[PDB]
């Protein structure tokens, strides 16, 4: 029959929409209409890390806010020191089709994954002083798009298997598997308390997952196009999402619906990376039109441009202390802005 | 400065020189290709050549070619196809006999051609299963005109080059498929990439030579465009 179940689901969606509309008192744009804007924000390239011979697909800042891990399609995972432009490491990747990389919060491990469907974890702090792969995390059906570290032993990977997974690095198995996404999960970001994390997928919906429970806490549907990047607010009570429709959208976890849409008529090119500042006031988005736009996350108005990349910007990260914004584009150059 | 700072600088210099040397070693006379197609197509048997992505390394004349057959992935391909926007060509493979899935081959090739990141990438079209297509046309059990009504208004091109011991009906059918693909490639073609059609059987062994010649043409046209001669 299935029609009774379809009708019940439709009524559930309708009443969820009604509850969301009832909770929708006033827009954040209306709330922030009183405050003065941030003003023009000019960021200059303090450092230009060169040494990648091909396009840089992803990067991740370290917890110390000094060492960043960079990944490219050449087949090298170069770890830099942004203060001195010193390549502290350069790991020969087995697979050159790496789409994501991460740096451990403790600083001892580095992960990477791509079209090989395997999350390779590299031990930086080895007794012999040479980098060796610690585990070949296999178990995903599709390509990995974004993997983040919870601890030295727990890692969460977003794959294009429409499923996020939680692994045990010591055992190398599926501690907890997250399912429910209709489309390829393209990026996830971890909450400050590491208890929750949201993920963006190719079904235009971002969902909030409980790491311990392993169940989708809630779903956010406000995007008209594929979602590519996602990042929590410094509260951990909100996040922003990028999408091919060139629209950044900020959702609130407790409100269960969006707050504002960071869009403009001129921008027509899709978003590849999204990152907040330390205070969350600045929403930096890396578009694939060869530059980046800094968005005033409160006034919802553009308040700066990070131009200087020749090719499409693929990755964009902000240090934990918020002293830099290192962008990495397809022109083989990774630029730190401040 | 300090001893630690000097050691860090020496390490950085050594890493940079190693990366540069390895890159110029592994990037000289080595071209990468994206082998794309359908399951019915003989993409696994295109080149005679004497767990999440396949690999095929072959050489013709002191030039190494790499083909990446992305097979262990989901049917949705709009996301992992952007990682292959640097290849010198795309080895598109089509089963000419299966007219049922020929239309999906056509619109897949159209999406590849019109993709924003694959606009520069030039497709080396490989119309495989020519023996099957010829057998179908000669038998006449399957009718191509029902699946393509515009075949009736089609005449074989004047400059066609059929094999001497071949049937005019088979020549007309295969060149109709070729023209279909070439019309798709030339309608929206911006001129920065070209479609190189070929007729491949399951027994052909010069597919490596065909790929070599077309990649030579691709790089030659790229150089001419770079130097403002084309």
């Amino acid at each position: 029959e299935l029609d009774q179940l379809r009708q019940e689901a439709e009524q559930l969606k309708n009443q969820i929409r009604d509850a969301r509309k009832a909770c929708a008192d006033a827009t954040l744009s209306q709330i922030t209409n009183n405050i003065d804007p941030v003003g023009r924000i000019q960021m200059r390239t303090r450092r230009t890390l060169r040494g990648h011979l091909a396009k840089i697909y992803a990067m991740h800042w370290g917890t110390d806010s000094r060492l960043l891990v960079s990944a490219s399609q050449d087949g090298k995972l170069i770890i830099w020191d942004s203060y001195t432009t010193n390549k502290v490491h350069a790991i020969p990747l087995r697979s050159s089709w790496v789409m994501t990389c991460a740096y451990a919060p403790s600083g001892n491990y580095v992960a990477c994954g791509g079209l090989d469907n395997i999350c390779s974890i590299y031990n930086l702090k080895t007794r012999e002083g040479n980098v060796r792969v610690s585990r070949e995390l296999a178990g995903h059906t599709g390509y990995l798009s974004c993997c983040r570290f919870l601890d030295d032993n727990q890692i969460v990977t977003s794959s294009g298997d429409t499923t996020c997974a939680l692994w045990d690095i010591e055992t190398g198995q599926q501690t907890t598997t997250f399912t429910g996404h209709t489309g390829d999960v393209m990026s996830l970001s971890l909450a400050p308390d590491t208890r929750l994390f949201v993920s963006g997928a190719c079904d235009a919906s971002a969902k909030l997952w409980d790491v311990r429970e392993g169940m989708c806490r809630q779903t956010f549907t406000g995007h008209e196009s594929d979602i590519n990047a996602i990042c929590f607010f410094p509260n951990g009570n909100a996040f922003a999402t990028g999408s091919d429709d060139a629209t950044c959208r900020l959702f609130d976890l407790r409100a269960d619906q969006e707050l504002m849409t960071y869009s403009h008529d001129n921008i027509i090119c899709g978003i590849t990376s999204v990152s907040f500042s330390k205070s969350g006031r600045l929403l930096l988005a890396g578009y694939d039109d060869f530059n980046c736009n800094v968005w005033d996350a409160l006034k919802a108005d553009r308040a700066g441009v990070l131009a200087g990349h020749d090719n499409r910007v693929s990755c964009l990260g902000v240090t934990d202390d918020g002293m830099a914004v290192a962008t990495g584009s397809w022109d083989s150059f990774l630029k730190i802005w401040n | 400065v300090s001893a630690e700072d000097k050691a860090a600088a020496e390490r950085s210099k050594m890493i940079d020189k190693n990366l540069r040397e390895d890159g110029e070693k592994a990037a000289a006379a080595t071209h990468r290709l994206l082998l794309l197609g359908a399951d019915n197509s003989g993409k696994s048997t295109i080149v005679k050549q004497m767990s999440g992505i396949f690999e095929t390394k072959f050489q013709v004349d002191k030039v190494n070619f790499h083909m990446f057959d992305v097979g262990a992935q989901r049917d949705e391909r709009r996301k992992w196809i952007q990682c292959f926007n640097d290849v010198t060509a795309i080895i598109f493979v089509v089963d000419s006999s299966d007219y049922n899935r020929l239309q999906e081959a056509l619109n897949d090739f159209k999406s590849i051609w019109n993709n924003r990141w694959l606009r520069t990438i030039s497709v080396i079209l490989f119309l495989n299963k020519q023996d099957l297509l010829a057998e179908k046309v000669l038998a006449g059990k399957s009718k191509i005109e029902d699946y393509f009504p515009e075949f009736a208004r089609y005449t074989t091109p004047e400059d066609a080059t059929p094999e001497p011991g071949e049937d005019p009906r088979v020549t007309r059918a295969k060149y109709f498929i070729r023209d279909e693909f070439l019309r798709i490639s030339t309608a929206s073609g911006d001129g920065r990439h070209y479609c190189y059609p070929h007729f491949t059987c399951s027994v052909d062994t010069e597919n490596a030579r065909r790929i070599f010649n077309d990649c030579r043409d691709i790089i030659q046209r790229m150089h001419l465009r770079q130097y403002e001669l084309l």
Partner: nanobody, 127 residues
Framework: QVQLQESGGGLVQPGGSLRLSCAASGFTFSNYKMNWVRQAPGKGLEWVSDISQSGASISYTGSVKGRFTISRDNAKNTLYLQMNSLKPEDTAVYYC?????????????????????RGQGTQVTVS
């Protein structure tokens, strides 16, 4: 929130005429290249027609060339497929599917098995 619910269809005698209509919500209907796809019983999805965002371009499958007409209403956010002079093989589940990205002339995953942007499917039967 992005529901491409379509209407019309049902049961019509062979050679009849059914007009399928599609309702698009949650996105700018004038930015996405709309598609029509059918799924025959026990068969994979087959792309039927394609109309550009502005409606200038247009294309059809060879099996339904001249027998199906596709039309979009940008103001009404509705997409139509004028099925007339039907044939027995037209019996299939029709989905109103849009191409994943706006301002793009390519459509990669429209015919996918579990594509995200498509309708539930209005059954069309002829006998």
């Amino acid at each position: 929130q992005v529901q491409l619910q379509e209407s019309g269809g049902g049961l019509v005698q062979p050679g009849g005429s059914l007009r399928l209509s599609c309702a698009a919500s949650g996105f700018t209907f004038s930015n996405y290249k709309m598609n029509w796809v059918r799924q025959a019983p026990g068969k994979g999805l087959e792309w039927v027609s394609d109309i550009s965002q502005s409606g200038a371009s247009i294309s059809y499958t060879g099996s339904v060339k001249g027998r199906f007409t596709i039309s979009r209403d940008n103001a009404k956010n509705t997409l139509y497929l004028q099925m007339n002079s039907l044939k027995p093989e037209d019996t299939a589940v029709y989905y109103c599917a849009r191409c994943p990205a706006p301002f793009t002339r390519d459509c990669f995953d429209v015919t996918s098995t579990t594509y995200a942007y498509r309708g539930q499917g209005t059954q069309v039967t002829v006998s």
